[PDB]
Symmetry: C3
């Protein structure tokens, strides 16, 4: 057994918070935006996770780097669902 | 034996930096703000750590997600000491 | 065998993205800035990695915290190559 691994990001004034947790090979997402926490749409395989986000005006963009073994898959939020990104690692 | 795990955040112009380190089940905090590094008030159990921070005007708010096993505790800095937050994980 | 560990940061409008990956004791860096991913100059030992970045005007500053065992080395980007920073951990 082992500890889960998390990554977090935030934006805005309230603020909006996203916390990604890698738990036994699966990454899920929890969301805060002023009231209580709730579960987000992100759900992808991964043993390790990192995240970064940026704003274009008021629109949030999120990149989640999910790693299983030596394979890191980037997942992209740009307002309309999660999609796989072009990220590949060195060599 | 194993490697420590860290998380970092920063704000401002100098800037101010916070680095959280999980070392053998305990998370401590180091701080930079223009001169040298010094130890911060955050000290809580955890094998894994992540962090995010945001500003309201000039006031910094920090959220540290500390995980021991499958249990993740959120710790909140809002100007006046660290307090436990409402975060819980999916299901 | 084990999974790689990553950290990510971003800045700007395009945006610019940096992803650091600790893979079998070595951390390398991948970069995005509007077209495709390419390999960055950062290459240092480490089993765990975290990152934070900030802007001074339009100039990016990056701090990468590389941990091997209980030893965490800070690496600094301030526009002109990576250099070791003053970071040390508690006690
Ligand atoms: O409001 C929740 C949500 O839509 O915010 C953007 C992303 O975090 C999504 O995965 C998530 O479902
Ligand atoms: O819109 C998707 C995308 O282009 O966004 C910027 C980078 O995250 C890329 O890897 C990714 O494919
Ligand atoms: O100046 C250090 C400090 O007060 O900054 C806010 C938090 O990082 C605290 O834990 C820490 O003691
Ligand atoms: O002020 C504390 C709090 O409400 O801040 C926003 C979120 O981090 C919540 O989980 C947390 O309880
Ligand atoms: O454009 C790539 C680059 O110069 O950007 C700043 C740092 O990420 C460097 O390691 C990297 O080579
Ligand atoms: O310019 C280097 C430096 O002073 O930048 C701020 C902190 O990251 C310090 O540890 C580091 O030595």
């Amino acid at each position: 057994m082992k500890s889960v691994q998390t990554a977090a990001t935030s934006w805005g004034t309230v603020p909006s918070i996203r916390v990604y947790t890698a738990n036994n090979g699966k990454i899920t997402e929890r969301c805060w935006d002023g009231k209580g926490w709730y579960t987000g749409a992100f759900n992808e395989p991964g043993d390790n996770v990192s995240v970064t986000s940026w704003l274009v005006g008021s629109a949030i963009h999120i990149r989640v780097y999910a790693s299983t073994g030596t394979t890191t898959t980037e997942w992209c939020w740009d307002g309309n669902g999660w999609t796989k990104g072009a990220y590949t690692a060195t060599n």
